[PDB]
Each structure stands twice: as structure tokens, then as C-alpha cells.
Amino acid sequence: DKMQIFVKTLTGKTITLEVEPSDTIENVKAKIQDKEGIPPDQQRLIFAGKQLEDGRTLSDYNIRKQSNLYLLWRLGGW
């Protein structure tokens, strides 16, 4: 069930992720940490105007193959 999605970061880079529909948002944040080093608790993963929640899967958000997502993160804070 492997597929890819595209994630555009706050700093303008487009990265390609290898994911499955059953992957959770936390799983996706872990993949992003491996590639870009951003801690998951700092990540704000966004699809179609909605910030995605830990505990849900890509399937729940109707995130199909070749979807385009945004990755923001916190600037500052504890």
C-alpha cells in the first residue's frame, strides 16, 4: 500500500515522503524528523486548510497519493 505525498516546508523546500494510508500523523512527523531534523512536537502538518491531529491516519483526512501538504513549525516557545 506504499505511496508518496509531497510536503512543502515553511522555508520553501518540497520533500517527498514514502507513506501508507494507515500511517498515523505521528508516523508521518517521525518520517519528517528523519529527513529534516524537526522534532515532531514542533511540527504543524497541514492539509487543505486543516492542521492534522496526532492519533488520526492519512486515510481519515482523505489524503490520497500525490497529495500536497504543508509543514509549518513553531518559532520560539518552550
Binding site: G12, Q42, I46, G49, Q51, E53, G76, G77, W78
Partner: protein
């Protein structure tokens, strides 16, 4: 190059939050008004740009506005989800001295104060990596902050020759 700031292209990512990735050097377009690195510099920076006759203690007012903003907006702020505290526990930490402000407080203050806040972020360089904008105003009416390093904020003012 003199009209560059009029050309910025903002993309809405979530309600009221926009991003841009223009290629420019901060000091080419902005005066950088340095703030103390005392953990309060998010709020010092907003104070420099919103409070006349700003001092090292103006930030207390901005933090009280942040408390008012949070009582209205914290529960529904998407970035508040990453904090994971109830409103009251968030407020106790936020109001403590030397606790770092962030993009979360920028979002809430923009609504509370009726202003647009832009955070420009750089990494060990004059080169802009990104701007994130809270509110629908343009760079010429916004409160422009400089985020550098991990948690440091300074204030920015557009240089006169670009007005």
C-alpha cells in the same frame, strides 16, 4: 529593487496564517532594533513596534494583552494544540518571567490588537528563509519581527527609502 516589498506573494496555509519565501536580505529593507536576550524578547520586540516611548519594561503590557488574547482564542488556536496545557496552566507559564514567546502568541495578539504580525526567520545569515504572517495586512502596515537562532526575536522597521 526599490519596490521589492510591494511584490511579496503570500499564500494562505490555514485560516489567517500566510507564508512567503522571498529571496532577500533583512538588513537591505529593514532597520533591525535589537532586543535583550532575556527570554522576554518576543514581547520586547512587539512593544518596540506598538508602544510609544518603549522601555525595557513595556513588555509587561504586551504580556497582559497576550493573557487577554489567550482567554478569547487559546482554546481554538491550532498551534495551542502543540502546547498541550489547559488555558489556566498555559497562562501561568506564559506570564512567568523569561518564558519564551512564539508564533502562538503572535497569532493571538494579532487578533487581540487588531494588527498584522509578520515573523521573518533567518538562520545565521542576513538571508530570509521564510515569512509567516498572522492577519491580512501587508508588510507596510504589519508589525515585522525577526526570528533568529532558536528563540531570539528582534523588532524590524521598514527603511524609509522603500516607502
Amino acid at each position: 529593487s526599490m519596490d521589492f516589498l510591494r511584490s511579496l506573494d503570500w499564500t494562505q496555509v490555514i485560516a489567517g496564517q500566510y507564508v512567503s519565501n522571498p529571496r532577500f536580505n533583512i538588513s537591505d529593507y529593514f532597520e533591525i532594533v535589537r532586543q535583550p536576550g532575556d527570554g522576554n524578547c518576543f514581547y520586547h520586540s512587539i512593544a518596540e513596534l506598538t508602544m510609544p516611548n518603549k522601555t525595557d519594561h513595556s513588555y509587561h503590557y504586551i504580556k497582559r494583552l497576550t493573557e487577554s488574547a489567550a482567554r478569547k482564542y487559546y482554546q481554538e488556536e491550532p498551534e495551542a494544540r502543540l502546547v498541550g496545557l489547559s488555558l489556566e496552566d498555559y497562562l501561568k507559564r506564559m506570564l512567568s518571567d523569561n518564558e519564551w514567546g512564539s508564533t502562538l502568541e503572535a497569532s493571538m495578539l494579532a487578533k487581540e490588537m487588531g494588527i498584522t504580525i509578520i515573523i521573518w526567520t533567518v538562520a545565521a545569515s542576513d538571508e530570509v528563509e521564510a515569512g509567516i504572517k498572522f492577519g491580512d495586512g501587508d508588510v507596510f502596515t504589519a508589525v515585522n519581527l525577526l526570528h533568529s537562532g532558536q528563540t531570539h526575536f528582534d523588532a524590524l522597521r521598514i527603511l524609509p527609502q522603500f516607502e
